[model samples]
Target: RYLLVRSLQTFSQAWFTCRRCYRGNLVSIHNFNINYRIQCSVSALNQGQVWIGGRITGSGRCRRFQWVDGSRWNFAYWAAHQPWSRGGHCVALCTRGGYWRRAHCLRRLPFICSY
Candidate 1:
């Protein structure tokens, strides 16, 4: 069963707070640009939180989570088709382009994180 305490509308804020509260990383269960299906465990719940982007709709596309504020490449839980090359840092393709594309982590784009 799912327990609802509050609803999150912003990915960036939600992600930052979630990670701090959960003490875990947002993982990729599917492709980089689709079906991100994030799963993380927090101390308060002891269960975990899983979020799926609604913009991408059904299919694995919605799984693509942009990512809030990540811990650089060092802590990135890169999936199979992730960590695309882009200068010195690594890029993860979000569902923004409907396909895989290079994205700098500090680009200030809204990500697909959970709370």
Candidate 2:
């Protein structure tokens, strides 16, 4: 199941909170359906940026990121010019357009999780 917890937190904090408190991992999106599906959930909260389970583990395009559950990239919905060359290594979802954007690991934002 998928879930969006209301508590605002940084990337690392969000992961740990979901692990220990919610018994889940930050949500992972491998295809279009789940990605858009999660976006609607975030939109319901009337929020903008919400954290996902992506990490910038490498450089260049799809190889630049991976899911927190140890899965590699298969699909992406990057906002225009996203995954910028200069920025933090974490990824966050922008609810307005349901697209991915790079974000600082420490910037507090609400996060989604899955169990």
Candidate 3:
């Protein structure tokens, strides 16, 4: 199940809350099927964004995004002009179209958790 948390916080806090407070991690989208469910989970927010699970891991010439839940990195639906750059960053999901985007890890926003 996916839980829509109303608390607005940075990616750091959101990740911790989802794991420690709720025993779940921020929801991760691995493909279109999962993306559809994630969209439904937050689409009622009118039009906004929510923190989703992901971090660009690795270093030295190779960096890639992987979910906090240790899910395989399989898909990306980044909005036009995003993820901006390959530099490490946090990810969020658009409540409307389900598009993903990168943002500062310190940026505050609502988040969804998966159990």
Candidate 4:
């Protein structure tokens, strides 16, 4: 489980929250913009392993740092008025809801990382 931070904040704060709460890497931005989820993998009795959680990153096209795990990009559920621009900076947009907007990557905002 995770807290509903409800707003964008600093990267350090996001990192701490994920580390402290989930004991897993911070990854997978839920709702596209809200925040990131703890990457917790577990082995099932009959299955090999499964990643069973998610969090919101508050933006899209997250380019500041490449996905820690080399996960593929899913452009299918892009929120309305999203993917601001190609080659534009990527920022998590929790402004209206969770979504990614092509903004200046240099701009600091809440970020999620994986272990």
Query: Model 1: how far is 63 from its true place, Å?
Result: 25
Tens digits of per-residue lDDT for model 2 on 3-106?
88788899999989878888889988889898888888878666688999998876566555678877767888889976587667888999887899989899
The candidate with the higher lDDT, 1 or 2, is 2
Cα error, residue 76 of model 1, in Å, equals 14
Task: Provide the TM-score for each candidate, comma-separated.
Answer: 0.30, 0.88, 0.87, 0.37
Candidate 2 TM-score, true structure as reference: 0.88
**lDDT of candidate 4 at residue 108, scale 0 to 100:** 43
Kindly list the per-residue Cα lDDT of model 4 for residues 1-115, writing each as its tens digit. 3333323444445545556665644354434232322212111122221111222343655524343234544432334674554534343434332334444433344444444
| Candidate 1 segments whose C-alpha is farther than 4 A from its true place | 1-15, 21-24, 31-85
lDDT of 1 by residue, 31-52 (tens): 4322322222222332222232
* Residue 96 lDDT (model 3): 82
Candidate 3 residue lDDT tens string, 1-115: 7888888899989999999988999987768988888788788885488999988767778777789999888888988865576423898888988888888889889999988
lDDT of 4: 0.38
Which candidate model has the greater lDDT, 2 or 4?
2
Considering summed lDDT, which 10 consecutive residues are worst modelled in model 3? 79-88
Candidate whose TM-score is highest: 2
lDDT of 2: 0.85
Candidates' C-alpha lDDT: 0.32, 0.85, 0.85, 0.38
| Worst ten in a row by lDDT for model 2 | 57-66
Off by over 4 Å in 4: 1-26, 29-66
